[PDB]
Amino acid sequence: EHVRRDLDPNEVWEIVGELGDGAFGKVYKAKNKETGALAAAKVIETKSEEELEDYIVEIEILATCDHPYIVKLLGAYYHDGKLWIMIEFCPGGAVDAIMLELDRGLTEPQIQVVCRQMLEALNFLHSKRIIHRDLKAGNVLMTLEGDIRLADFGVSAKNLKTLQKRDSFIGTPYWMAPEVVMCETMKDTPYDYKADIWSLGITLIEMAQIEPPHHELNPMRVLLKIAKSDPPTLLTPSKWSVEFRDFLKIALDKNPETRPSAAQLLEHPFVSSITSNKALRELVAEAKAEV
Numbered sequence: 001e002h003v004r005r006d007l008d009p010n011e012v013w014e015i016v017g018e019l020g021d022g023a024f025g026k027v028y029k030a031k032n033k034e035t036g037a038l039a040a041a042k043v044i045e046t047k048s049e050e051e052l053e054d055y056i057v058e059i060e061i062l063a064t065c066d067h068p069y070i071v072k073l074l075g076a077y078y079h080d081g082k083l084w085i086m087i088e089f090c091p092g093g094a095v096d097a098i099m100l101e102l103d104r105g106l107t108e109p110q111i112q113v114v115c116r117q118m119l120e121a122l123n124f125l126h127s128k129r130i131i132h133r134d135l136k137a138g139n140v141l142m143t144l145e146g147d148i149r150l151a152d153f154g155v156s157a158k159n160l161k162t163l164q165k166r167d168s169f170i171g172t173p174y175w176m177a178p179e180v181v182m183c184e185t186m187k188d189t190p191y192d193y194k195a196d197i198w199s200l201g202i203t204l205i206e207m208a209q210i211e212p213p214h215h216e217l218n219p220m221r222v223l224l225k226i227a228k229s230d231p232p233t234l235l236t237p238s239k240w241s242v243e244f245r246d247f248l249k250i251a252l253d254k255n256p257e258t259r260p261s262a263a264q265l266l267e268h269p270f271v272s273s274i275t276s277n278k279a280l281r282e283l284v285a286e287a288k289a290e291v
């Protein structure tokens with residue numbers, strides 16, 4: 001429905017830079033030759049219809065999300081042997097890249113805005129039973145106006161319509177909920193969506209401390225560490241308000257049944273009074289000043 005095979009995107013889009021590479025193909029920065037609008041271009045070269053299903057589901061996810069805090073689908077093409085997914089480009093970049101550029105973590109007011117907007121985005125997704133499943137600071141993008149966009153629904157799309165949990169990941173899963181580490185069949189429970197709430201909590205600590213919990217270990221031990229350890233905490237509690245520590249205490253619940261939902265966490269005093277993104281605009285403006 002959203003994929004066009006008649007037109008070649010190379011006549012429509014000019015590749016103007018490379019945003020990331022991996023086994024998944026590449027992500028490009030692209031400028032449309034007519035408008036000049038920018039886009040992230042996820043290009044995957046594959047001819048098998050099984051593999052193409054996974055990526056068309058990602059297009060389907062983006063197409064149904066009209067919420068502003070999710071990256072927008074700008075268009076989609078398949079010809080030659082490559083599928084092009086054109087996605088909203090966020091000039092602010094990812095939060096993890098911003099912390100590296102500034103050589104510091106976010107302030108608590110900045111984390112509160114990110115937390116609040118992430119919670120509204122998750123409440124919107126979960127109401128459609130879309131579970132992101134791969135939250136981390138690298139998948140929280142920023143606009144220059146100081147709002148987030150959740151990105152990279154690749155893991156979400158490969159798990160959306162199938163009943164067999166894809167027990168398969170790349171890299172080190174610092175953000176994985178303990179029931180997912182233990183490979184529990186969460187789809188036969190009410191609590192599959194709770195994995196995102198745990199990942200959100202880890203992402204907050206990552207933004208507080210620049211690196212996620214257990215980043216200092218040999219990466220081979222992280223899964224075991226997540227399964228066996230008490231929930232992570234802010235290691236310098238005097239730096240942070242009791243509301244932040246309390247929010248983390250309830251979100252980083254190892255039991256997915258009692259872990260709160262995104263809607264419940266929107267009632268928490270850490271975010272219940274956050275109405276302005278000003279603190280994130282300042283952060284983006286300060287990051288733009290460094291480069």
Ligand SMILES: COc1ccccc1C1=C(Nc2ccc(C(=O)c3ccccc3)cc2)C(=O)NC1=O
Nearest residue numbers: 019020021027040071087088089090138139151152
């Ligand atoms: C996290 O964002 C995406 C993630 C995946 C696909 C697209 C995006 C994305 C944007 N920015 C990017 C793209 C890539 C990167 C990377 O460093 C990277 C490196 C290796 C593997 C994956 C990512 C950072 C920001 C953007 O502006 N709109 C989008 O949808």
